[PDB]
Amino acid sequence: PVDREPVVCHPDLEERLQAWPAELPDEFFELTVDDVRRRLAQLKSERKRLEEAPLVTKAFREAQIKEKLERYPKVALRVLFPDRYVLQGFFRPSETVGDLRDFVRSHLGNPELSFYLFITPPKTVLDDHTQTLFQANLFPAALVHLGAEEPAGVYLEPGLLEHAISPSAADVLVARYMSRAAG
Amino acid sequence: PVDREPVVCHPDLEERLQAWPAELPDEFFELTVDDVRRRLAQLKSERKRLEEAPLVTKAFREAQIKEKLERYPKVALRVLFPDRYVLQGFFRPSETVGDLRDFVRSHLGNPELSFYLFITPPKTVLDDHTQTLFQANLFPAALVHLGAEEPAGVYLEPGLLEHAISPSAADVLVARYMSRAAG
Amino acid sequence: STAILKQKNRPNRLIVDEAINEDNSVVSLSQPKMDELQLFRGDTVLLKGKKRREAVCIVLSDDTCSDEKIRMNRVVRNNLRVRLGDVISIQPCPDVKYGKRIHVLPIDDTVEGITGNLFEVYLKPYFLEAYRPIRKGDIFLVRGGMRAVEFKVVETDPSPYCIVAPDTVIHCEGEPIKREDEEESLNEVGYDDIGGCRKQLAQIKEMVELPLRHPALFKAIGVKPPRGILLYGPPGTGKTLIARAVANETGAFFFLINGPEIMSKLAGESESNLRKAFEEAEKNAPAIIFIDELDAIAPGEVERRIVSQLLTLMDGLKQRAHVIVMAATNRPNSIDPALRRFGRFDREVDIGIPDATGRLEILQIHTKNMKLADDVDLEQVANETHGHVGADLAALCSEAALQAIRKKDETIDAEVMNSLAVTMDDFRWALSQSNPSALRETVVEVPQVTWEDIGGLEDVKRELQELVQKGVLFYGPPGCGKTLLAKAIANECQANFISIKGPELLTMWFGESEANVREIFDKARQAAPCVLFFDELDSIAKDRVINQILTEMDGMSNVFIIGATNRPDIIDPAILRPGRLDQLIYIPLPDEKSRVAILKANLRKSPVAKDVDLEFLAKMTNGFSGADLTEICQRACKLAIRESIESEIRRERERQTNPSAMEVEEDDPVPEIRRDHFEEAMRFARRSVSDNDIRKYEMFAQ
Amino acid sequence: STAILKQKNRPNRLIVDEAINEDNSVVSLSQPKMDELQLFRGDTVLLKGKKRREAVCIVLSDDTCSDEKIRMNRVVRNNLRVRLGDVISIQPCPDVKYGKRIHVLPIDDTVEGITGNLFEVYLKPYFLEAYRPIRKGDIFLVRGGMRAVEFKVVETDPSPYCIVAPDTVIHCEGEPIKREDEEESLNEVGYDDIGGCRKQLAQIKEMVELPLRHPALFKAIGVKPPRGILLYGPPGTGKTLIARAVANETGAFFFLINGPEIMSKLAGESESNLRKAFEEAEKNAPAIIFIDELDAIAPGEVERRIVSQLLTLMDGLKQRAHVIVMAATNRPNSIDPALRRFGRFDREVDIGIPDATGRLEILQIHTKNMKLADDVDLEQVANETHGHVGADLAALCSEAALQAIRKKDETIDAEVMNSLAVTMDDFRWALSQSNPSALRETVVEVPQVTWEDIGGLEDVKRELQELVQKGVLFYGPPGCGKTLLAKAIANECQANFISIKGPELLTMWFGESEANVREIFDKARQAAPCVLFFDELDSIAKDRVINQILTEMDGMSNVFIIGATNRPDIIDPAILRPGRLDQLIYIPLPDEKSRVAILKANLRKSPVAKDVDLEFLAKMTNGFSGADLTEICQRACKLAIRESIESEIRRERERQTNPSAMEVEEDDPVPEIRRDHFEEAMRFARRSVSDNDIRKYEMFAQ
Ligand SMILES: Nc1ncnc2c1ncn2[C@@H]1O[C@H](COP(=O)(O)OP(=O)(O)O)[C@@H](O)[C@H]1O
Ligand SMILES: Nc1ncnc2c1ncn2[C@@H]1O[C@H](COP(=O)(O)OP(=O)(O)O)[C@@H](O)[C@H]1O
Ligand SMILES: Nc1ncnc2c1ncn2[C@@H]1O[C@H](COP(=O)(O)OP(=O)(O)O)[C@@H](O)[C@H]1O
Ligand SMILES: Nc1ncnc2c1ncn2[C@@H]1O[C@H](COP(=O)(O)OP(=O)(O)O)[C@@H](O)[C@H]1O
């Protein structure tokens, strides 16, 4: 079905020549008169929200899920290796966790190795290969850590390490699908 | 899987020789002092119920469904024909509507005829053959009316009409599974 | 002898309760009771009351239903001639013969105002393959065409009861029937007609149900019944609705005493009316006496006289009289504490503004007659509709219904009226078309504005400064400082300020009736000294409101009052009589000098160009108001900052080649606001006054 | 210059809000903001406050979060040295180096009372493959062993921040650290420690947050802040809890004035204490002054003197003082109306008994430290626990925790304490073991009981009849008519009756402290004339309660008071002094004659046999009480009716052969209650008194 369109990035490969972000004065951190005026309106609205107790309906949920799936038709996933290397790939929201694990075994140093994926903090391991990326909160874009029983085994792959790119470049592939659709 | 154990009953075949139910005096319909005392306790409890607003949890629902399915492990269904004849059969709670429709085509005058089943009042036709008897509220024991486009077609079957029994007898088959389990 | 039957027939002896299923032929039972009687779901049962009247209903299972209890709706309860709490006897009757023919006729008052065939509209789909059990004398109802039509069953073949088969012939020949006394209206109020509060009802039922239904057993039970109850909350909450329903469901007589209405009548005629009211209730007892708006009585001589008379009648009611007095008001505090003491009104129930979950109930109640489009989500409306009490949502559904009818005799065809569907857009319309902008969250404030902050208007400033240190009407083009002046006063007089727009006085649907009119003045009185500021007095027109304002006004004074309008021509001059507000102050568009002062005042907060001529800004901007002048300066800054950052971004990037380079003589670019910033910022729009109008403002005083 | 950065960095400029996720390293953002910054879920971000202090947190998406807002918990807010509403700057920092080694030490006061290895218990599972971002100086917490332990990060390699890899070495060598002033306790109250009311908090935040946090901008904003607020509801609702949290989250100084405590002190010392209290708040301003139990002050000379002093201090607080006075009580009505008027206490918030949904929040808050068994359903507990305020549920979780510990030094091993799991049975125990049977729904009643209804006790009846037409203590075996006599009095005296059992005075967990003690007397006073009846006075023992009863008692009188006990030996004799209650009336088991009268009275309602000898029934039943005598007659009827119906069923069936047969001389079988009915009905059990006891009752008076 989908094109994975894989890439690999590492913090070292980032140019890291960037100019320092300008340090900020105390003025930036203090509020305008209108800020207070707006902040008050936040408290008022939240108060009124709790008072009337709006109805959450099953029709609304299904409608919100739909408009959410339509907003992000393609899901971007990043598997972070213990060696700091990052494996990036694209997925459909209805893709499973197993589909991700198979995607990992593909680019590995060998499929023979046993491993596991998890999200942090705290450590939560994904046991369910049936589970979709949507209900696993891997949506729309998520970072996943790769664990293993014998981590000395998982090097990812050397050939891909030659194709490895800058993290800032990997984001420009993602930013396309985030601010806009597939093209 | 299950044994349908079919039977057919008709109001005519009921002995209908039964003595009249004793008419009741106005005393039976007027309240004891304690009745008022109990009725008041009903209002109090219902009031307190609405005040504290008890939590309905998904865990409780699934638990209640389970204890409900365990209480009535076998479902009894009665299909009422326009000719007043009643077709009785036993089903599992997880059986579908289609499984019921197939059960009907079996004992018909011919499977070639087109028909439909529905529950009343009001008239609600069961379009879903995937739907289980549980979620169709055919549980634990339900009466279903049999409709057709050309009702002159559906006679049920003559051979079964010879095996047809009394309605009071058909209940003794059901009462076994209602007050007690399958045996 | 007795305990035998009640023990022998105990499985068949049940008590009536409110039903979830609103269907006519459906009654509900508990699953264990269903099994105990060997009852299938959808099976036919027979019910019998003390009245000897029978009924035939289809039985369904209910998980919420108690084992000892049976639940049936209004339709069934009346056909059995029983009410909530009453005892019935039930048997599982399988036999019932398919009707060969039946005879059914409509009730006259329900069918008023329509032409058509009521069979094909109402009765046809109702009886089609529904296999409904039907007995003679039964009165049921069918809902459609913004209407609920009652039908009476004249006779059945066989009798008394049968069921309607597709082979059954329905005979509709005849004339609409006059009502009978024994059968109460189903357009008469009941519990099922009250949404948004189940709890408040349960509290009331708990107190008044048993004393009203059967006081003699409630006597021996030993517990002491409440003599009176105070219902409170805003108007249109269902207080009067609740009183009528409770009295009805209990079968108790109902007497309404309108607080203002009884107060109008001359001295000695009023006292005589209370006495007649209570005496009539005692005569028709068990009865409920509902006093509407109690604060119109006991919150002069005759003032106390009727109150003392009331206290006598209240204290004059012994439990044996079987009378319970209900009273409604806004807050219990507005009522004389002598009433709220023990023995008279002991308990009080709060009927409040319903939450979102509650408004859904109210909607569902009032849409029951009308056919809804599939795109209509009522729960979503419930979230969109705020601050709405029952009367408002009822008015909402009523209006939204009309909108659909507005697509199109004085007498309407029943078929098309029934086929008419109400869409969501119809609701969105009705929710939009008429409503404030009321409640409104009126807030007391102490403005920091001074005379300095207001540019120009020096001739006006001096005038105002003299008046202090009876009222004022500011008028002129909008945005020239009407409101600013009002606060400058409040600050100088060192008083509180209260800002209120005109429609905030009015309710939803721009109702002329306003209780809140005095409520503003009350808080204007609560705070003191205070400046009451009416913004857009011309908005009072959506009459009764204008007068009741003048009354409250004159009633006090220290509270100072200031009106403001951009359209003074339509303001009723009666509010302008010298005794009320002397000064009429005209605030014009800021002149050339005033604009310079205004522009300066705004531009003092950020750097400005060398080439910019403020006097020239006062030229290129003239028809400008203060609101525009303060806006055009904000846009200029916005254009100035966006220009600086895109320049500042441009540099950050151009440093990527050589970060290491530092140039000391090269300094930071200084942001400046120049003429072409204002030139470009002058576009945003628009809102100007006609030159004709200016004359009307000048020619006003007269 | 300013507006540039705020516009330029606008995407990076966010405001702090309360967080859903209670994790230490987790912050939440809105999805659009997440995308705008090109942030992955679980990615690392850097936060910076005005204090220059940084932090590194993992970012997650939140649908409930506003775009302009960021949400972080207590742990993060303190590490950034910021509070709710404050402004922070955020950047998506990918780089962060995996920690080579780190150094972390515990805080001394949190680790008090335990031995063990805190690494293997707390820090080990916390940091294991969680890849948590960590910066120096950070103080986080780990929960376990009925305890929350704070850990401080001494140093990181690299610095200032790093993340903890499985390859990272955690250095725990050292000594527990003393606290620092700049870091507030996380065992200090906050919003996250308040469950059951979100709304009431939002109302309070709305009023007091901005005036306390930055009054100077709130000044220019123009709106007028409340000078004082009245919190009301029953005790243990979180009122004092709320006051401490609000003052804390706003960074405002907190001063508690205990109502009774300040009232004790001698004349002139009290007035001096108020002045010092307010002056100190004004000195440490912005500040919150919390007055606990305000009704202990303003509901003699010095009585008014301190109230007038209070009114001066209240009215003496200008907005510039930056002080907001909070006060708590039961109901606003109990407070002097002079306080509740505008300008002093304008607004009042209702802190009530939480609903079921609310009690779940409270439970979740107090179970956070303890490890729960998998079989524990807290929401189901919430449904089971009723009428519980926050203090009760807190006491519930505290007790239930102990029960598990009760399976087993003065100083406990940290490992086993942490591994200890609390089961549902532990909760069911704790919910069972100690609690009434309080609230209790006390009901006023007017009993229809007369002297006639009471059999025997003629010697006692005459005595009581003489006393009327100061108090009485009924004592004797239970079920002989103690309560019946009390009502016979109320009926003869034509007064109201109030029945209350002993533990109803006590609260849950049988708390000796009772506010409700006077509350009974209050309603006993509300009604009048009234007979106050204390049932089971011996149950007062689960002390302080006995006295405060005597006080209230003597304080009035017309209210008549009657005690009753089946165990008078343990009743404190101080309640029995002649000045309080003279008559001590002993009610014995009904004698042989009395039993005949009792049995007759019960059997008069249904037919009786020819062979039955009532005097013989009085023989075969002696140690029987009135409760037993009325019971044995009910069983006899029950046996009589069951026998008749099974006979009546037997006939109905035997008529199936020949229905047509009618026999006129054959009559209906007449139900009768005979001797062997009573003989058989005598089994049901049991509850008898020792013959020893009888002497103790007779030998009582002395
Ligand atoms: N809880 C409610 N459910 C349904 N309708 C309501 C409710 N409350 C008010 N209404 C509508 O508001 C109208 C006015 O109600 P009423 O009780 O007569 O006035 P008030 O509430 O001011 O005493 C009624 O016609 C009724 O249709
Ligand atoms: N004379 C003035 N000097 C300075 N600013 C003014 C003047 N008149 C109006 N403004 C600006 O226009 C806005 C609208 O003023 P306001 O008095 O609230 O409306 P209106 O005059 O229509 O009642 C204010 O925010 C104020 O900044
Ligand atoms: N809403 C609540 N959430 C959590 N705990 C609560 C709540 N209300 C009360 N408590 C508990 O009750 C105890 C007493 O609270 P406090 O406010 O000091 O007394 P009061 O509520 O009588 O003013 C506190 O220790 C607190 O743990
Ligand atoms: N002297 C009596 N005569 C008749 N019935 C009695 C007598 N004493 C007790 N009873 C019965 O016993 C029951 C318990 O009486 P009560 O006075 O309420 O309890 P106690 O005497 O233990 O306070 C009552 O319901 C009453 O019917």
Numbering used by the authors:
A (entry chain A), B (entry chain A): 317 to 499
C (entry chain B), D (entry chain B): 13 to 311, 318 to 426, 434 to 494, 512 to 584, 598 to 612, 616 to 760
Which text from the study accompanies this structure?
The AAA+ ATPase p97, also known as VCP (valosin-containing protein) in mammals or Cdc48 in yeast, is a homohexameric ring-shaped molecular machine that together with partner proteins controls a plethora of essential cellular processes such as ubiquitin-dependent protein degradation, maintenance of quality control or homotypic membrane fusion. It comprises four domains: a flexible N-terminal domain (N), two AAA+ ATPase domains (D1 and D2) and an unstructured C-terminal tail1920. p97 is an essential protein, with orthologues in archaea and all eukaryotes. Biochemical and structural studies revealed that a C-terminal fragment of ASPL is necessary and sufficient for p97 binding. This fragment causes efficient p97 hexamer disassembly and spontaneous formation of a heterotetrameric p97:ASPL protein complex.
To address this question, we determined the crystal structure of nearly full-length p97 (residues 2–766) in complex with ASPL-CΔ (residues 313–500) at a resolution of 3.4 Å. Protein complex formation was induced by an ASPL-CΔ fragment that, compared with ASPL-C, lacks 53 disordered C-terminal amino acids. The asymmetric unit of the crystal contains one p97:ASPL-CΔ heterodimeric unit; p97:ASPL-CΔ heterotetramers were generated by a crystallographic dyad axis. We found that the overall structures of the p97:ASPL-CΔ and p97-ND1:ASPL-C heterotetramers are very similar (r.m.s.d.=0.66 Å for the matching α-carbons), indicating that the N and D1 domains in p97 and the eUBX domain in ASPL have similar folds in both complexes. However, the p97:ASPL-CΔ complex buries a larger surface of ∼7,000 Å2, suggesting that the D2 domain of p97 also contributes to the assembly of the heterotetramer. Overall, the structure of the D2 domain in p97:ASPL-CΔ heterotetramers is very similar to the one previously described for p97 hexamers, indicating that ASPL-CΔ-mediated remodelling of p97 hexamers does not alter the conformation of the D2 domain. However, we found a different spatial orientation, indicating that binding of ASPL-CΔ to p97 triggers a drastic reorientation of the D2 domain. The movement of the D2 domain involves a 141° rotation around a hinge located at residue Leu464 in the D1-D2 linker region, indicating that p97:ASPL-CΔ heterotetramers expose different surfaces than previously reported p97 hexamers. Interprotomer contacts between D2 domains via arginine 635 are critical for efficient ATP hydrolysis at physiological temperatures; in p97:ASPL-CΔ heterotetramers, these contacts are not observed.
